Design a protein around this ligand. Sequence first.
Ligand SMILES: O=P(O)(O)O[C@H]1[C@H](OP(=O)(O)O)[C@@H](OP(=O)(O)O)[C@H](OP(=O)(O)O)[C@@H](OP(=O)(O)O)[C@H]1OP(=O)(O)O
Lengths: 547, 314, 106
Amino acid sequence: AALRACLILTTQRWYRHTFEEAEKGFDDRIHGALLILNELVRISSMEGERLREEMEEIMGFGTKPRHITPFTLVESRCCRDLMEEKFDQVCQWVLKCSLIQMTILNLLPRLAAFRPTQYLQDTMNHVLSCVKKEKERTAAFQALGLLSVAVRSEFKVYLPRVLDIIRAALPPKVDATVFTCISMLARIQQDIKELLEPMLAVGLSPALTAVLYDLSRQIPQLKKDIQDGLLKMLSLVLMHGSITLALRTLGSFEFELTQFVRHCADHFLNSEHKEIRMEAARTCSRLLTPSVSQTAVQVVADVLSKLLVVGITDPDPDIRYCVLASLDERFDAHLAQAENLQALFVALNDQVFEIRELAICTVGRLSSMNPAFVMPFLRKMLIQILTELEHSGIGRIKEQSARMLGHLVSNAPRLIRPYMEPILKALILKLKDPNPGVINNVLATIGELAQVSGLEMRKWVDELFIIIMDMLQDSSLLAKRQVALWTLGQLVASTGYVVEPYRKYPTLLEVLLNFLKTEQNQGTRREAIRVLGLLGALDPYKHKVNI
Amino acid sequence: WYEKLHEWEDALVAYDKKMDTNKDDPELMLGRMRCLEALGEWGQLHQQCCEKWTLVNDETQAKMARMAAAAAWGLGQWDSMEEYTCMIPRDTHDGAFYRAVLALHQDLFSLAQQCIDKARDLLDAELTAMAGESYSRAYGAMVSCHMLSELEEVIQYKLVPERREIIRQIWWERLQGCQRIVEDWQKILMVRSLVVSPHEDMRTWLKYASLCGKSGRLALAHKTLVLLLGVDPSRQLDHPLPTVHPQVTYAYMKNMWKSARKIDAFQHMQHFVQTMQQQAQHAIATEDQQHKQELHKLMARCFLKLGEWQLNLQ
Amino acid sequence: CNPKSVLKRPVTSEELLTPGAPYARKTFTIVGDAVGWGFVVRGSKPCHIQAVDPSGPAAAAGMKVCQFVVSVNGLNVLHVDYRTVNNLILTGPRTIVMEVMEELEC
Ligand SMILES: O=P(O)(O)O[C@H]1[C@H](OP(=O)(O)O)[C@@H](OP(=O)(O)O)[C@H](OP(=O)(O)O)[C@@H](OP(=O)(O)O)[C@H]1OP(=O)(O)O
């Protein structure tokens, strides 16, 4: 493993030495010899590594952006000889050598892809012997699938041994490796038609669902048959930890379901387990896809009611957090009910900030749609946000209030456009207080306030450049300058200050160029370039005049 | 040698001698494309690149792809610019800029944003190395990132119609600080064409037309004036010049005086000042705040030219 | 002057429909990139591929120039204009499921 890491770095950025050292042991020293060869084979040929990664593991270009964006060779020559030597060792050391057997399976997957049929038949036969052997069934399971990846003709008829082995073993019952072999060998269309029945009795594991999901998307031979078994098993699962996995399967991808949603409001109201309630909120929201006929309009407003009650009175915020997170901007068509508002109104005055932060953003679009009661209530809350800034001399409290302000303006820009005076004046005085946490939030809020008030924030830019420039130029503290740089270019793309600041401040051009070499973060560098473009491309002579 | 001096008019004739007399390797033809692009003659460049696009090496057309795309963009033929765009290398600054402006035309706002961000990191490497020597050396790349920020404002222009009165005000004041170079203004003004037509803002194009004539080629400055009028006054001389757009026709009469016509311009100037006096009067509506003062200011310039030109002629 | 054209075959719509021909059908799924897929289709009736970016994702997963398409993301587009196919692929998801005629060197 250490040699492979060193070899990988060299390959990304000694081939003769590696080949010569391996040949010394080829002419106790069984697992080590294959391990070195396997690392060299993997580095030389990484095509088979994708299959191993997949086995271990198992929206749109035309969308309008949001109006208010918040802050973010030698080895190849010695290939046939190595393959011939490897075949002899496997055939000879078939049962008399488990350290060698463990390394043999790893070497076989690399050799099959690199060297593609006497060798293929012998490798499958050796894997077949190790299929029923101890400590080799799991390793040999992917060995058969690797052969089918290299050539479909090699496993045209010999792949059926894997299906035959799992034909009676799966129904009888180590089930994780059984599903992996089928998925690896899947990539003809009639074998999986009836072989899925043994996999049903194998067990309820994430690997089985992940493998089945991949097969349907990659190879939809019989989508209806695949959806028949998947839907039938899920329905009977809830008829009586195992149940939690079944709920995730339905919420993973789309299916072809009004009987589940009516009963979907029972587990979190009766089961005392905290883990199951976490997924209960998520599966309800994603299962309401069909949302003009008075057959589903009434029921959809009913299933939404249960989540709202749970999301405010649950003992732990973790269950409440996922309730509101699931109810995204998509559900704006069903959150306008007056009775449903009371659940959201209480969420503003909640114990934890994680729920309040999302609640104020959620009601921001709700306030623009239902301002009958939200608008009078938010007037008192806004004053308390500013009240804690000055009346209480605590740096932790001020940071909390400022962050909530950004969510409100970034979601309801129209209401805040003429009300810049109570906010901008307070924030400016905050920046000149005679705690780095508060600074990173007021600057982000100001940048968001500069987008809504186009050409209106004109009398404050003169006094706002000084505050920002001191945070960048002659910065005694190496704090986060990304926020200051981002808002500096955000209040000049709307106000219109482009060429004039280059004269009043004959240092802005120099300091921005210095950030290219000193700073190393990719996001920060792409923002300094944008500020340069927004300011302009003044000729070099005027730069000399400005000194 | 002429290309290294940024002198293209005598560079093109040099390649003509080496090509028209005898065809040679595909290196002289590629040299002309670098000269036609700099001059700004998209009509001649488009026919050469399209005809030669087939019988060239695959590696050879990689260099030609960037120049051929600009000619299609200048002519407004977006149907063929797509084919030329997909052959520019995707790991270069120019390879992402030309496929970013292509997304704007077909209304792909999400795809265009990634390309703009992708082009900034590619230009980052080229800008930091040049900035380490002096600011003057690092100016050819700064004008490139200036155009990158203009594409973002194009996205905002197409989305919110309420801001299409200050977007075409930053573009004016930001261009004033830029160096007065015909090549620099040609690229920047071409970016400001996917949304705003030349007839939508003659104030910027009139300043560009004057720059071309004063320090560069008079031929380029002449075709940019007939475009604004919509008709070519050079075709018919007996007919009077167009009366509408007094500012545009005022600059046209100065162009005739500069190049060859010191007598026809004087005759047309007399008829222009005569008609403006009648246009100034007989106006029941009162616009003394802006229109009347602006009209009177133009009259002083027109009368001043009459005195100077008549003394020169007589 | 404006069009260029690449494929030697003038028309192949009727031959494509006929079962007897050297071509073997293949389905290619192309994943989107940070700057685009990098392929152009400019065939009136058959909607043949016009050009492919050699460094683009399409060229990595086959997608040679001399190919014809009949279905995109499931929908059958065997007989439509090239412009209509361009609208469909852009309005679809980032990942595009495509079928390539892939003539066998004939
Ligand atoms: O070079 P000229 O033929 O003498 O014309 C100049 C020139 O105008 P153009 O841009 O149309 O060439 C000046 O502009 P620049 O030198 O800055 O480019 C302009 O001055 P302003 O930009 O300040 O308006 C000035 O106008 P004016 O006479 O009002 O001083 C105007 O002179 P004429 O109108 O007399 O030709």
